[PDB]
């Protein structure tokens, strides 16, 4: 037999740090759907959503936003921002954000007419293919950067509440792999970050013992 199907025309998500568009709701999903993933706060509650194919989400068709407001970081420095994609059969977008720590909560309802039209789809589409490596190459260098940015602030959290027990020779060359991260993280070679990190990482083992004191 054959069907009309009811499934996303594009890929929906929201605007993550450095600049990406992270997918919840994946191209070509069936409707209705619902989708959550948890994210790690850094800085204000944005929820920008964003609806295409592209990497930079700049690149990408804004569809709306919504702040969060009054979050404290969970402790322990755990995961707390829960999005969650809701699209109802008539094809509705429902967003919402809830801190898991204090339980507050926003959403926001999507217009149709926010989205991108048919010709705007098929060129979406096109412009993704014809940009593939460079939206790889782009993700992977600002994940890079996030997760080194994470070890270098983290790391010189631990090195001020540790203070006087941190002995001067580890403080010396923890202080030493942190500007060499600090300067990686600056550049655009990926392996260097990571190497940097690595290199820090050694040097933090009697840190890692403080802390978990």
Do not use: W, Y
Not at 4 to 16: A, H, K, N, Q, R
Not at 43 to 50: D, E, F, S
Not at 74 to 81: F, K, L, S, Y
Request: glycine share 8%; proline share 3%.
């Amino acid at each position: 037999s054959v069907l009309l199907l009811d499934v996303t025309p594009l890929s929906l998500g929201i605007e993550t740090m450095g600049g990406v568009m992270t997918t919840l709701i994946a191209k070509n999903t069936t409707i209705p759907t619902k989708h959550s993933q948890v994210f790690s706060m850094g800085g204000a509650v944005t929820i920008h959503v964003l609806q295409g194919e592209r990497k930079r989400a700049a690149d990408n068709k804004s569809l709306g936003q919504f702040n969060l407001d009054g979050i404290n970081p969970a402790p322990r420095g755990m995961p707390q921002i829960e999005v969650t994609f809701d699209i109802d059969a008539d094809g509705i977008l429902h967003v919402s954000a809830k801190d898991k720590n204090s339980g507050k909560e926003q959403k926001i309802t999507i217009k149709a007419s926010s989205g991108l039209n048919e010709d705007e789809i098929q060129k979406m589409v096109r412009d993704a293919e014809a940009n593939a490596e460079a939206d790889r190459k782009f993700e992977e260098l600002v994940q890079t950067r996030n997760q080194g940015d994470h070890l270098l602030h983290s790391t010189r959290k631990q090195v001020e509440e540790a203070g006087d027990k941190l002995p001067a020779d580890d403080k010396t060359a923890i202080e030493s792999a942190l500007t060499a991260l600090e300067t990686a993280l600056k550049g655009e070679d990926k392996a260097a970050i990571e190497a940097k990190m690595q290199e820090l990482a050694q040097v933090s083992q009697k840190l890692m013992e403080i802390a978990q004191q």
